[PDB]
Design a protein around this ligand. Structure first.
Ligand SMILES: Nc1ncnc2c1ncn2[C@@H]1O[C@H](COP(=O)(O)OP(=O)(O)O)[C@@H](O)[C@H]1O
Ligand SMILES: Nc1ncnc2c1ncn2[C@@H]1O[C@H](COP(=O)(O)OP(=O)(O)O)[C@@H](O)[C@H]1O
Ligand SMILES: Nc1ncnc2c1ncn2[C@@H]1O[C@H](COP(=O)(O)OP(=O)(O)O)[C@@H](O)[C@H]1O
Ligand SMILES: Nc1ncnc2c1ncn2[C@@H]1O[C@H](COP(=O)(O)OP(=O)(O)O)[C@@H](O)[C@H]1O
Ligand SMILES: Nc1ncnc2c1ncn2[C@@H]1O[C@H](COP(=O)(O)OP(=O)(O)O)[C@@H](O)[C@H]1O
Ligand SMILES: Nc1ncnc2c1ncn2[C@@H]1O[C@H](COP(=O)(O)OP(=O)(O)O)[C@@H](O)[C@H]1O
Lengths: 151, 151, 151, 151, 151, 151
C-alpha cells in the first residue's frame, strides 16, 4: 500500500539541538520517500489546532507555548506502512520508555521535550498533512529505487 | 561455544542499495569473525535449493526469481551464539515488525524485499554453509582479540 | 558578518540517492543555522535562471534539463563565513578534484552528477536565495548555542 | 528529577577494543551531562569492593581478576532518569539477550566480557560514585542546553 | 571508461582490526560497483608475485611475510575513474602523509601497517585482478542507480 | 618513539556541544592509546600557565577567560607520531583553514571557539602533560593490538 503518507515534525528542541538531518536520514535509509518539506515557527493557533485533541490535558498550554516558540521542520513521507513504521522509528512518548535506536530513545530525555512528532494513524496523518501543507507544496516523483524496495 | 558459524547473505536488493559494508560492519563491531566471503548471482536452482523448505508457499516463485536476479553477497561468521545473535541483528521477517537498530528495521520496508538472509538455526547454518561454500573457501584464522571478546 | 547567508541545493541526484539528511547533518555539525527549506521540481525556466550566468557554456543545456528532471531540496543556511565553508563542505566542482570528507569527495563521480550546489560568493548567494525563496518562507530565529559557536 | 547521577564504567575489554568514545557519545547525544571522568587500573580490592554483592558467585574470582587487569574508564552522568535510561542504553547482562542499539547488544558477545558497567539503582549509583570518585573530582556546571532538554 | 576496474585489498591488519565493512561502505557511498570479493590467506608466493614489481627494495621481505601472515579481503570495484579515486579514498602510502577522511588518514599509523592496498594505475589493476581472481569469480551486473551516478 | 605522548584538551565549547566522545573515538580509530583523562574547570591561573608562551598577544586575555569559563576534558594519548597526527586530526588553528574530516573542519567556525587543543610539538606536549596531570593520574598499559598497528 505504497501511497500511504505520514507527517513527521522535528520540534523546536529537535531543531535547536541539530537533529533534523539525522532524523531525515533515518527515514531515507529505510526506503521512504520525502515528498514535502519546510521550516517554520508555528503560531499559537497552529500549535493549538495541531494538538487540538488534548485541550483538556493540564500540559496543553505549556505544550502549545513550547511548540510555537521556535521553528519546527515539517515533512511528509510516503511508502508502505509509513505511519506505523514512523512511530516505531520515533519511539514511545516518554523518551524514558523508548528504546535505543529510536529517535526519542537516542536523543531525548524528557517527555516534555521529545524532539519530534509523528502521525499516529492514517486518518490523523491525512489530517496533519492538510493542516500544514497546501496540496502543490507536495512534490510528486518516483524513486529510481522503488523496484528495489517493493515487490 | 566459539566455533559456531552462521551463513548471512545480503540479497539482490541489499547489494543494489549499497548495504553490504554496513551489514559487514555490524557483525565486526560485535566481535564476530568473518571466515568466508564472495559475491555471485544465484541461479534458479541455487535460489530453489536455498529456499527449498518453502516450495509450497505462493510467494516461492516470486522469491526464487528475485533471489536469482542479481548478485548476492554470502558470508560465514564465527563465534558464541552467532546464529541466534545473527537473527537478533537482522530483525523480524517483515521489516514492519522489525525494530530500529536491526538491519531489516533500519533499511527495509517490504517483507518481499528485506535485504538480507540469516540462518535460523545451527543445523540450518551448517546446511547453508555447505551449499554455498566449498570447504577451503573457508579461511581458518584466529582474531588477535579473542581474549578481549571471550573468557 | 554573522548574518551571512548561503543557498545550498541538493540536486535531483542527491535526492534520488538518499543523501538529503546526510548533507543537512553536516551543515548542522559545523554549527550553521537552517532558516529555509523546501522540496520542489524546478521548471526548465528556473533551471535557466538559476544558472543564467552560465548560458554560453557547452554543458549548459545538459545541465539545464538534468537540474529540472526531479525534485531538489533548497536550503538557506546562516552563519559566519557560511559561503566559503559551504563550498568547503561540498568540495571541488568536479568530484575528481574533491577530497574525502567533503560531500562530493565521499559521494560523487561525475561532474554532471555532483549531488549538491552551493553559492560561490556572497553576491551569488543573495541572488539565488531571493531567486528561490519568498520573504515569508524564511525563518528567523536565534540558536541557543550562538555563544558556543561565535566569539 | 535532573540532579540524579549514575556511574558508568567502560571495562578492560571495552577500553582495549576502542569503545570509550562511542559510549561517551551515546550518552551525550541523549542529553546527559558528564560531570566526572578518569581512566585507571582497578586493584584487586577495588575490583572486589566494586562487585562486593556477588562474592558468593562462582564467577566472582574470574570477574575480579578480569576487572583489575587493565584500565577502565569511570564516568558519572547527570539528568532525569539517568540511572534507568543508563541501563536501557547498556543492554541486558548477557550480550546475547541484548538488543541491537544497546552498547552490549552492538559490541559484545559473551556475558563474561560485556564491555561496560552501569549502576542498577539510585542508591547503588550513589554508592559507586563515592567509591571511585572523591567529591571535588566532580565538576559542577550547567549545560547551555538544559532548557532544550528539560521543561 | 565506465568499465574501468580496480583491485582493493584489505590487508591482514585491516581484517584483524574490524575495518572490512568500513572500507566496503566507503566505496559504495562514492557510487562504485562491487563485482568480486573474497577472503583467503595469501601464500608467500602470492605475496611475492603480488608485489614482484618491488622485489629489489629493503622493506620487501618484511612486506612479503606480513601480507601472508593472515587473511586479507580482495575486491574488485567497477566504475568511472575508480583507480585514481580508490587511491584517493585510501590516502597516501605512508599514513603520516594521509589526510583525515581517507582510510589511512583515519585508521593507520605505520607505513608497515597501512590497512589496505589499491592499484596504482590501470595496467597494475589489470595485472592484480587477473592475478588474484579467476574469470568465473567475477560478477557482472548493472547497478540500478547507474543514471544517478553517471552523466 | 612508540612512547611519544600528546596532550589533547577538549575546550569548554567542545564539552558544551556534546563533542567529547566524538574526539575520543577519532583518536582511538587511528590506533592511539588513551592513558589519562579527566574533567575539571581550569582556574584563570591554569589558563595563564597553560598558555604562558602566548601572554604578549592581543587575544590572550579573551583566550584566558574563555578557557576557564567551563569544564574542559584533558587527555593524554600515546603512540608513534601522535603529536603531529593529533594536530592533523584537529586541523588548522583557525577553522577557516581546516579541511572537512578534521575535528575543526567538521565542527568549528571561530578561531575563538575551536573546540579542542593539541600540543604543537614534543617539548610542548611534555610541558602541558606534566602541567595538567600528576604522575599517579597516568595509566600505563599495553594495547592488545600493538602488533596490528606498529611495524
Ligand atoms: N505527561 C506529559 N507532560 C508534558 N508533556 C506531554 C505529556 N504527554 C505528552 N506531552 C507532550 O505532548 C505531545 C503529544 O502527546 P501524545 O499525542 O499523547 O504523544 P505522541 O507525540 O507520542 O503521539 C508529546 O509528544 C509531548 O511533547
Ligand atoms: N508473506 C511473504 N511475501 C513475500 N515474500 C516472503 C513472505 N514471507 C517470506 N518471504 C520471502 O521469503 C524469505 C524467507 O522467509 P522465512 O525463512 O520464513 O523468513 P526469514 O528470512 O526471516 O528466516 C523472506 O525473507 C522474504 O524474502
Ligand atoms: N566542464 C563541465 N562538463 C560537464 N558538466 C559540467 C562542467 N562544469 C560544470 N558542469 C555542471 O554544471 C555545474 C556548473 O557550475 P560551476 O560554476 O561550474 O561550479 P559549482 O557547482 O562548483 O558552483 C556543476 O555543478 C555541474 O553539474
Ligand atoms: N554467568 C556469568 N558468568 C561470568 N560472568 C558474569 C556472569 N554474570 C555476571 N557476570 C559478570 O558480572 C558482572 C556483574 O553482574 P550483574 O551485576 O548481575 O550484571 P550487570 O553488570 O548487568 O548489572 C557482569 O556484568 C559480568 O561481567
Ligand atoms: N619506505 C618503506 N618502509 C617500510 N615499509 C614500506 C615502505 N614503503 C612501502 N612499504 C610497505 O609496502 C607497500 C608498498 O607499496 P608502494 O608502491 O610503496 O605504495 P601503495 O601501497 O601506496 O601502492 C606499502 O603499502 C607498505 O605496507
Ligand atoms: N588571531 C587570533 N584571534 C583570536 N583568537 C585566537 C587567534 N589565534 C589564536 N586564538 C585562540 O587562541 C588559541 C591559540 O593557540 P595557537 O598557537 O595560536 O594554535 P593551536 O590552538 O592550533 O595550537 C587558539 O586555539 C584560539 O582559540
Amino acid at each position: 500500500m505504497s501511497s500511504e503518507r505520514t507527517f513527521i515534525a522535528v520540534k523546536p528542541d529537535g531543531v535547536q539541538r541539530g537533529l533534523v538531518g539525522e532524523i531525515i536520514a533515518r527515514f531515507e535509509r529505510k526506503g521512504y520517500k520525502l515528498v514535502a518539506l519546510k521550516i517554520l515557527q508555528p503560531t499559537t493557533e497552529q500549535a493549538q489546532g495541531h494538538y487540538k485533541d488534548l485541550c483538556s490535558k493540564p500540559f496543553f498550554p505549556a505544550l502549545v507555548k513550547y511548540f510555537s516558540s521556535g521553528p519546527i521542520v515539517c515533512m511528509v513521507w510516503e511508502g508502505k506502512n509509513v505511519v506505523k513504521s514512523g512511530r516505531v522509528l520515533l519511539g514511545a512518548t516518554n523518551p524514558a520508555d523508548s528504546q535505543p535506536g529510536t529517535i526519542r530513545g537516542d536523543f531525548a530525555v524528557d517527555v516534555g521535550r521529545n524532539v519530534c512528532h509523528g502521525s499516529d494513524s492514517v486518518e490523523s496523518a491525512e489530517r496533519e498533512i492538510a493542516f500544514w501543507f497546501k496540496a502543490d507544496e507536495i512534490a510528486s516523483w518516483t524513486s529510481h529505487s522503488v523496484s528495489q524496495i517493493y515487490e
